[PDB]
Amino acid sequence: DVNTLTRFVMEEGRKARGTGELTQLLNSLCTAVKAISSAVRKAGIAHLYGIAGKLDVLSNDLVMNMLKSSFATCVLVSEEDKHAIIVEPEKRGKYVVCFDPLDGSSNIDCLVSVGTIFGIYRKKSTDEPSEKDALQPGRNLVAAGYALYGSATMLVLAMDCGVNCFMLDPAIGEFILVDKDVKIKKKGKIYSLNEGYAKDFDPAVTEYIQRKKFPPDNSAPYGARYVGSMVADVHRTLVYGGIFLYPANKKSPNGKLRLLYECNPMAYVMEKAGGMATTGKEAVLDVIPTDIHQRAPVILGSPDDVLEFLKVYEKHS
Amino acid sequence: DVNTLTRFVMEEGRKARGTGELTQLLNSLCTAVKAISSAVRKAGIAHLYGIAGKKLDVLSNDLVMNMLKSSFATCVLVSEEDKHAIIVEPEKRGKYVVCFDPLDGSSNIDCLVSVGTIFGIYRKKSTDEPSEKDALQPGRNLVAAGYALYGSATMLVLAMDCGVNCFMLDPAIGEFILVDKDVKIKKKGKIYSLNEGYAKDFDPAVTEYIQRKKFPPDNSAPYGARYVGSMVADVHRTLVYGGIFLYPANKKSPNGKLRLLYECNPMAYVMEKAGGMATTGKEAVLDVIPTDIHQRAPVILGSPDDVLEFLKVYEKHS
Amino acid sequence: DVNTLTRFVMEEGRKARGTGELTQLLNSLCTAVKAISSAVRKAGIAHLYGIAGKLDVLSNDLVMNMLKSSFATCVLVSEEDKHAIIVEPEKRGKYVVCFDPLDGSSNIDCLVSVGTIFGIYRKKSTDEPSEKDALQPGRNLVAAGYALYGSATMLVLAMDCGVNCFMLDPAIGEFILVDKDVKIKKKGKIYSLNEGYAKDFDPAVTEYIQRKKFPPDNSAPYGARYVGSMVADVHRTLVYGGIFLYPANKKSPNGKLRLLYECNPMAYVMEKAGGMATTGKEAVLDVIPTDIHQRAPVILGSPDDVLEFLKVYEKHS
Amino acid sequence: DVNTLTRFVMEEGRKARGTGELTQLLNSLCTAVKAISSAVRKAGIAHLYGIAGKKLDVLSNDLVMNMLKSSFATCVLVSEEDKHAIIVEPEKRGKYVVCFDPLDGSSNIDCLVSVGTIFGIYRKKSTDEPSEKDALQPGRNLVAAGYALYGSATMLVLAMDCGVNCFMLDPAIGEFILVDKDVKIKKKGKIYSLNEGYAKDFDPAVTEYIQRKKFPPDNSAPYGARYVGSMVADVHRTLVYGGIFLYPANKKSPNGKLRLLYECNPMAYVMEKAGGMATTGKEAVLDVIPTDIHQRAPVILGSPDDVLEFLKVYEKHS
Numbered sequence A, C: 001d002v003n004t005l006t007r008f009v010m011e012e013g014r015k016a017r018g019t020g021e022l023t024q025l026l027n028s029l030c031t032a033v034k035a036i037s038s039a040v041r042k043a044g045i046a047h048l049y050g051i052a053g054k055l056d057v058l059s060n061d062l063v064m065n066m067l068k069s070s071f072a073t074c075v076l077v078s079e080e081d082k083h084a085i086i087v088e089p090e091k092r093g094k095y096v097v098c099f100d101p102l103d104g105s106s107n108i109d110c111l112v113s114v115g116t117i118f119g120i121y122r123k124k125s126t127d128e129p130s131e132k133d134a135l136q137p138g139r140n141l142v143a144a145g146y147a148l149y150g151s152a153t154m155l156v157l158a159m160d161c162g163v164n165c166f167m168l169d170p171a172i173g174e175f176i177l178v179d180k181d182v183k184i185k186k187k188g189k190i191y192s193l194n195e196g197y198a199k200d201f202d203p204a205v206t207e208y209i210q211r212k213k214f215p216p217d218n219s220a221p222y223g224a225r226y227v228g229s230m231v232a233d234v235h236r237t238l239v240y241g242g243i244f245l246y247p248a249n250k251k252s253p254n255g256k257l258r259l260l261y262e263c264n265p266m267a268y269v270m271e272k273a274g275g276m277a278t279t280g281k282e283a284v285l286d287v288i289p290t291d292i293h294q295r296a297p298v299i300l301g302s303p304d305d306v307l308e309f310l311k312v313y314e315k316h317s
Numbered sequence B, D: 001d002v003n004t005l006t007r008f009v010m011e012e013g014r015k016a017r018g019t020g021e022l023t024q025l026l027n028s029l030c031t032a033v034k035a036i037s038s039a040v041r042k043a044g045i046a047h048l049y050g051i052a053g054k055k056l057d058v059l060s061n062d063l064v065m066n067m068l069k070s071s072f073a074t075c076v077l078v079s080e081e082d083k084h085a086i087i088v089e090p091e092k093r094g095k096y097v098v099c100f101d102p103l104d105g106s107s108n109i110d111c112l113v114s115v116g117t118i119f120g121i122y123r124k125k126s127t128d129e130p131s132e133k134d135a136l137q138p139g140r141n142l143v144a145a146g147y148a149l150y151g152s153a154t155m156l157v158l159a160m161d162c163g164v165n166c167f168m169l170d171p172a173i174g175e176f177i178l179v180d181k182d183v184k185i186k187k188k189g190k191i192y193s194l195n196e197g198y199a200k201d202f203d204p205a206v207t208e209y210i211q212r213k214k215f216p217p218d219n220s221a222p223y224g225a226r227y228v229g230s231m232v233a234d235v236h237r238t239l240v241y242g243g244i245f246l247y248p249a250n251k252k253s254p255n256g257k258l259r260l261l262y263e264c265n266p267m268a269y270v271m272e273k274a275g276g277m278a279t280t281g282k283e284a285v286l287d288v289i290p291t292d293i294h295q296r297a298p299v300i301l302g303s304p305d306d307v308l309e310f311l312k313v314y315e316k317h318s
Ligand SMILES: COc1ccc(-c2occ(C(=O)O)c2C(=O)O)cc1
Pocket: A008, A009, A010, A012, A013, A014, A016, A017, A018, A019, A020, A021, A022, A023, A026
């Protein structure tokens, strides 16, 4: 029996018997993703090249305008904006959204996969809404996920009910549910990080990669894959198993991926799908943030691969 | 003044003073690429999942095959998907030979990684009945070669004697728009690209070159690493940003792993026409003479300074 | 403020504080409309013609399966099905839908405009659902409308709040609201019927048309338009005003157009937009049906034009 | 065996051993048509309504003009949208004259009625500097003519000396697929098409002919009536289903209202190449020599038996 993203979101909203704001939110966000997707695949590029006589800025505008006009949000934090955006009073609702509107576009000149990452919170205060309202830890997420603009476009949605993957059918502009209640493999065969930073690696990371290239017990070495686009690397880890790493080194004691709108949503999707995500010291979702653009190390993926990483991590104290 | 793939192809045909076959060929193939692109982005997938109640690389291979045959411009077609060369039936014969990988990367297309189509075109070097031998030319004889990348958008990269040209597919009207004329690769890049999970098996020269990239001698910054696992995506990133790509010969695979006729050769041609290099380690990829249509070959390609810096290490190890 | 069909439908349901069923029904039905539109415009036709080596059945299948899987319906009446379909128990909801999945399709070989017509009732009886639940008169309609696949694709949705027109953006698969709370002109300058039936016309119809071609007063005669596709002619009548006729003659004392899934929805759209729709003797929404595929004559459009006709019909009565 | 418009036009151009100009022309016009179709179906309309925070007939005329100019195949362009003929600048000139209605039916596009692009192509008949004089040839001089209908689907109908061929636009891939080879119209149809609201102004011959269709003398069934009000839609139905279409001369309009160069002539040429007829009443439409580019002409076209039966009635009334 066929199911769409919009009908799935509408039913989950019906069962919660809430105000309906989170339903309007997710429908607004899904509409923005379809618009971004069309723009990313270069619809209308012929007009810019004279047939009749910016992508990360346009994407950021779509998500902002779609979220504001949903009447479901009060605080908006974006990778593109130095400060939180406070939704005007007439359009305020009770949700806080952190998003990276087009992750990976720094390298979009080469047509690498790009994505939209988001995490949604309920306001935990009563005062006038502020940047403070988005400084909740990952565990407080009500929903998170991403849209991948790869060889095709898929939205991956995480809630307490689990992870569901919807494929965008461009013929009709509808997200079709294609993978229900996804669970990640217990252990994978692929490891993923930028190894050009090897001279700066934490010594514990240096051993784990050694263990992947050179296995102790007669096993085959892991394959290496690193697209350089987080949504692409994390989705492949979800589909094929394995591990993804962008860790803390000494030249970067807090990693480089941003916590509120990259590490937390991916960590949340990973945990709801039977996987793990750690800074190294604590679970990613247990970090309490003090600044909306602060960074965080992240190692996520199949539980056996993250555990094996943690087994080695404690060997270096 | 606006320029499309069709306008570019018709204009180059005028300058070549030919029969017009290669123009129908490139136009037919470009039509197959539009159909592949549509299937890859999952048009009609709602019908597979029950809205009203064939694998992609088999579909891709059929699109390319049927479009090329029906161009009346080919005689021998070599495909990654077919163990033997296809001999185009006589009433549809033309003078060109086409080697192609109809959907390179599809081993990992389940994760929505970038995938592509790769192609290389030769002029038939015979008068007799056409045969598999007509595809056993080295890359240097290539008349036209390139790829379509099905990435964040769909781009066709077309390399000929006049140089490398990049066309963007506008899905609203199904047209390849020329967006980069006469492309050239940076002289030297800051990214290196290969699968390091095979590190225990590396040639000692490869092990040193990667070591030189992570730990630079002259106190410079180390290179960044990228490896998508899909050749078209990695090669294209190498063309746009410069850098180096490696799927080299090790000992356990003395001939590399990538296929020569429809992966190494088409990519080598694009690289050389764009001011870059592509080497097996011992000779330039385009100078290898093939003895089998599916034979493998090592490949190291990219910005000219990086392949030279690699060959210096390769020759230091005699 | 941007407004989509999805936002419009959800907002009306929120204010009504109902079960949420009618919202998923209309959302499911609109998805079926997007799929029909893609098929009508011949997407993928290159595969039927050998690039790699039924239309009104496909449409009926889309509306059927999409309505069933919405969990909001119990009885489905289709122009394509001889008897009413009773949705199986585990998928039942409290609504009844009469629909024409591809009206006009006999002339689709010439690429004339075609359409999808629908009307929605609430189950009124207390029994097990049955064909009787669909034999309500038009006045009991909860919602009705059409999709027109013309030069572009538009969904026209009429409810108690009035008539609203939504334009399908194929780049993103979204119905964009483009005409809020539309009303038909008091009097138009176009009349629409098949004048090849002239020898069989009711004597009152023959006089009314004569009045349009040869005006009694100092006025200009009406222009004539007849596409032959009910959705197309009815939409032109809403946009530009005027009158549409498919009346009772001698060969068909009950006309030819079907009451439940052609005459009723159009009459409901017409009335909610300030127009009228009459059989000649009674208003279309006042006919009590005894068989789901029964016919009814129809004269609809601007009220002054329907009235002027009714003055003539009673003169012959 | 599958054929596209692009393959078909390139193959016919090869067979004619011509300059390639008409090939460049039709490919540019077909590209303009795909872009028109995308806008007509309201692609991107969400952006005008604030999703992120120019009328169809002006855009169509601008698309067709720009594609034709930049094809290097034309010198004079006549459009319903332009008061005087357009003279293509010297550096972009070629030998063809094109008369077109860029978005016929668009006065009522608010009701989403089917609309279309109509076009006719002549060879320049002078050696002088090109001018409006070059567009005043009769229909018999037509080299190619036809239309694109933006209906329930988008179809391009192309008529040449080789006959009439119909191409369906596959929006999934942006390609015109050949779906109807060498089309021929019924000898006699069962549908008549005109605006009968103008009844008080009819020519007495039209009044009798229409009377004969509603009330048949020879005891046959009466004809059906269809009139979309959009020439391309009504003419296309007459081609696919047979029958007769009329926009004739009355007393208040002795020349009808449809324009001769870019509505009557192309439809007449398609009609004749497809085994049908098209008359002013007095002469065949293609035999009229025009004196002004925006001049009107009466037209009765369709199946040969129906136009003949009408002419018998027309000659009965002198
Ligand atoms: C799409 O799944 C959903 C949608 C909405 C909810 C939801 O739960 C409590 C709500 C509240 O109003 O407090 C609320 C909402 O409507 O904002 C839950 C899941």
